[PDB]
Symmetry: C2
Subunit: 408 residues, 2 copies
């Protein structure tokens, strides 16, 4: 993640996560030994048990694997999502219009450069995009053009195998959308689960009893079922079939949307932790991936022309990223303001960036000095810590500059 | 299906349905040559082209394949539906309780006699039934007992792999059942599609316009979608995934339920043929499988205790078997009466079997003599053709006997 120099790098065991340590990770770990321009030498100690020792020596003497890219379809695969995405991007973008061009493109891949089957993989990917009509075939050979369902995947950056599920889910929402709360909007922008946390199903079912009626109404629409939650409480649930994989994913996705609903209502991370069991960094790493996904789904609906969906969803990318009520969404345009600092300026009465740009800097200082509880009390992710006087002056001047940029 | 002895059995080609004949079928054909006690010798001619002579001689000289059981799980199969049903039937019936008994039962199987892997096949089937709790494991080794879902799937004679879909479909119907017409019931008792006809999708979508709103409301509930009908009209549609397989099955199952709804309302087979394209024998064979399946779904709901479903479903086995309105269902208890003859007796005023048993035989004769339009006018499937006087007398005496049997 970050370059930190250290003199002594200790690795407590050659085994990580129940696996032997990856040589790439080990060389990244050990490569941080030695404080540049301060140490005479760097030191690393792999602490190793007598039973581990053969693995430990393998880490010291081993060297990185050659690169081999995902465009190789494995045994029993006729297509790969990276290749499908590749063929989509060139057809829908229009830079490869014909099968003669698609072979000419594929010869530029690192797969071709590594081989220097692929001519079959191209055709199999074309066939998948065609049968679902991400692309359409016209007679010249064949000339392939996108549909609206194709062009939307390229603009959204959504994976097209997921796009069939996203597309049908959004249509089924529009057939009957619960505007009564933001939970139905949230559910559609929740990511696929990807094990962002270990769900405590006995907590989740005991929340489901308390869950507001207008949120259980969403749950029945999206497909949650309280008998299956009780079956998760009763014991281990396993999915053998793609039907069962989809059935289970809905409940994990709904639990995620409840965490986000607390997150976009400024519920403190300590209270979310106590209520759902999540760690702070799990909630924040969920928050980033949901905010990214909320962007994709907006552009996807806009390209299709679901104008009433893009109105609702567009607010949520910013609103998820900071995790704020609807009113703070203006203030946060000042990058010095997080949800905490925006709420204290909003609480005082600086409801909008234009009013904040008018503000007397001494008043912003006194608001921050009082509301937050020298010594660089405030942290700004692009800076070292700031004093109240310095942060307030930079806030006002940044708000004015935003007006200057917005008017220009 | 019949003993018809013929003096010559000509077979027009060695190829049938685009394949060589099965030697079992060919010997079932040729074995019909020679009329017992009439002929001196039977004859069969396989007509064969010069291109086919090698296939022809192979049918003449070839001999039947050894019989081999379905319980041999193939490569890539962990379980087979036949073995699962075998293990279910003994556990839910209670004739095998422990794994010691299940290995003992398997030694009685023709699989074992043919071998004389299977000990693993038993355990894999037990694990499927356990994970879905068709059976519940308990600590003694393990002792396995049925659930209600096991006992219902056994008593229904349904396949247990399908029973997970049937159970979830029936529950989802009970959350919101359209009583406004019998189509939502017919969608639940109609079998899964079995290539009983080739659907003309341009006809089907041209019906979907005219379909009554009380029946399009069912279609929305069951999951039929007019955007997917348009794809079927637009061109070929295929299933790459289990999601796509059921999405197509739902539409084929709805089309089948409309054909049944016309049968259930006594729409003539010629009018059904013109309206849907089915042959008479396709419709009449669909009646048999739908009436069998309507019986299974009743017993399934009865054992689970869905008393409101079995109260609705239980009319449909008889009603589908004959293809009658609700009122004929009493008269039809007379096995001499089909839907045609029941409707002429109901139209005259013999609304019930007790009132038919009272009838003057000469009056039943005159009704049949008039209403049906002595050369054996009436065909009775258990008999040669009958005259009006003979059929009417047998009808009245059979109605009286039914009272005697019902009172006894």
């Amino acid at each position: 993640g970050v370059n930190l120099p250290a003199r002594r790098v200790i690795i407590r065991t050659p085994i990580f996560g129940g696996r032997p340590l990856d040589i790439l990770t080990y060389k990244q770990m050990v490569g941080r030994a030695g404080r540049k321009g301060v140490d005479t030498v760097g030191e690393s100690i792999l602490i190793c048990k007598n039973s581990e020792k053969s693995k430990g020596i393998a880490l010291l003497q081993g060297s990185l694997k050659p690169v081999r890219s995902c465009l190789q379809r494995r045994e029993g695969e006729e297509v790969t999502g990276s290749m499908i995405r590749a063929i989509l991007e060139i057809i829908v973008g229009g830079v490869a219009s014909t099968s003669q061009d698609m072979h000419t493109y594929a010869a530029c891949t690192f797969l071709a450069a590594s081989m220097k089957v692929q001519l079959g993989a191209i055709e199999a990917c074309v066939m998948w995009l065609l049968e679902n009509e991400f692309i359409q075939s016209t007679e010249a050979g064949k000339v392939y053009h996108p549909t609206h369902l194709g062009s939307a995947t390229l603009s959204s950056s959504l994976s097209p195998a997921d796009t069939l599920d996203i597309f049908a889910d959004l249509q089924r929402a529009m057939k009957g959308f619960v505007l009564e709360n933001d939970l139905h909007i949230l559910y559609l922008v929740t990511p696929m689960f990807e094990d962002w946390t270990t769900i405590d199903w006995y907590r989740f079912f005991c929340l489901w009893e308390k869950l507001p009626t207008s949120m259980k109404r969403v749950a029945e629409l999206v497909g949650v079922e309280e008998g299956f939650l009780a079956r998760c409480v009763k014991g281990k649930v396993v999915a053998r079939t793609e039907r069962q994989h989809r059935q289970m994913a809905i409940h994990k996705r709904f639990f995620t949307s409840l965490v986000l609903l607390d997150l976009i209502s400024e519920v403190p991370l300590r209270e979310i932790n106590q209520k759902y069991g999540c760690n702070r960094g799990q909630i924040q790493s969920l928050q980033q991936s949901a905010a990214v996904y909320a962007g994709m789904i907006t552009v996807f609906s806009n390209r299709l022309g679901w104008h009433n969906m893009e109105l609702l969803l567009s607010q949520f990318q910013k609103r998820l990223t900071f995790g704020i009520q609807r009113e703070l969404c203006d203030l946060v345009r000042v990058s010095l303001l997080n949800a905490q600092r925006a709420r204290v300026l909003y609480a005082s009465g600086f409801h909008t960036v234009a009013d904040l740009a008018r503000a007397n800097i001494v008043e912003v200082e006194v608001i921050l000095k009082n509301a937050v509880p020298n010594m660089r009390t405030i942290w700004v992710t692009g800076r070292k810590g700031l004093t109240e006087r310095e942060a307030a002056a930079l806030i006002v001047e940044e708000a004015r500059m935003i007006l200057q940029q917005d008017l220009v």
